[PDB]
């Protein structure tokens, strides 16, 4: 009955913007993946270094559950080795990532009639993110030789841009909620296991 709190991540009422992606450390529990297998919502359920059918048989030192909202045609960027605005500037997985990426369409929750603009992504950055880096800076991006002095201008852009989630948009531009489960094996004793 000490079930890992998957419902708190997958079913949280609010999800974070991808540039400010949330992370929940998960330990000292039995993870019941049945709730994931028995879900009809998921459009993406892809695992790396682990098999989706074998999850209930494996034990891990720690689990991290990262969550955020992106648009649908960007879910393909949540995978090892990817490029693009999301993978490079917002949320980056390492080449040797061990875990699963789960995504489902959340148009009924995260769009609204005039458009929902509360979800944002980082559009400009001086360098690519490192794996699992979270950059929440709102500092003006200097695209040119001219310094910006904290002010937007000709070659000085605010680094974040809103998604406009219109309920009538096509699915490629609809909001998708994403959970990334990363499974870390250290030499320490294990704390998270499925029903063996």
């Amino acid at each position: 009955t000490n079930l890992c709190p998957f419902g708190e991540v997958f079913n949280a009422t609010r999800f974070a913007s991808v540039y400010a992606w949330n992370r929940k450390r998960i330990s000292n529990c039995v993870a019941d993946y049945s709730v994931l297998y028995n879900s009809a919502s998921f459009s993406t359920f892809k695992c790396y270094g682990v098999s989706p059918t074998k999850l209930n048989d494996l034990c891990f030192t720690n689990v991290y559950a990262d969550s955020f909202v992106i648009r649908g045609d960007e879910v393909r960027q949540i995978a090892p080795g990817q490029t693009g605005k999301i993978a490079d500037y917002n949320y980056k997985l390492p080449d040797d990532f061990t875990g699963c990426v789960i995504a489902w369409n959340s148009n009924n929750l995260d769009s609204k009639v005039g458009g929902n603009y509360n979800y944002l992504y980082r559009l400009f950055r001086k360098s690519n993110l490192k794996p699992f880096e979270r950059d929440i800076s709102t500092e003006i991006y200097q695209a040119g030789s001219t310094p910006c002095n904290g002010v937007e201008g000709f070659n000085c852009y605010f680094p974040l841009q809103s998604y406009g989630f219109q309920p009538t948009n096509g699915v490629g531009y609809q909001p998708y909620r994403v959970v990334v489960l990363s499974f870390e094996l250290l030499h320490a004793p294990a704390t998270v296991c499925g029903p063996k």
Partner: antibody
Amino acid sequence: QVQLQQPGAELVKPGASVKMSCKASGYTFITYWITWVKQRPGQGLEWIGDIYPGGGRTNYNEKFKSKATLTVDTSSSTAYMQLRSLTSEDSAVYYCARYDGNYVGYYYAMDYWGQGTSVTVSS
Amino acid sequence: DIVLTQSPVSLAVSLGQRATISCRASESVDFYGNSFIYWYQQKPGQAPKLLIYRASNLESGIPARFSGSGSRTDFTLTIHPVEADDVATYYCQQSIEDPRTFGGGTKLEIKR
């Protein structure tokens, strides 16, 4: 036009090595797994291993971890399998194919295939 | 290692008639309502072609003359009506556990 292209045939001396290519086109190479399968003349199919081209994670059949090494070159959208210390038992057709790995969709289904490289081990 | 056994090894069927090919798994391939069985068709000299995934789902572009059924250990590919260009060997594959394994194949011949 999704396409996987392999060289048709290779002749390689016993005890030597061979490296075979699988050139992908018509889709985003780094978002699909590439898998490799062995078919000995008149026999069924045998799974060799898989590689995810984004980052190059590999998974091997235990029977083939000493025989085969899978790599990719993402800049050329090409996957490679190297076979080491070849014997007559390695004479066969080797297929590359792709799968998307999505547990709620096609999963391990091989929807697109290369046409195979036929390897003859002879001196 | 799951062993898949296909019967019959060979099969002759007339045009318009029904061909049923069976695949038997040494262990259950059922996982939370899904049967992770795939069917492929291989004409001579060519790569296999995907027909069925998840034991009953038809790949797009494949005629509905092909159908997949079964559960747990026993699975079946059915071709009705059989046509002349169905001459091929048919293979089943499991992916519930690694290593993924294939059956030995069923060769289909047209009776004319």
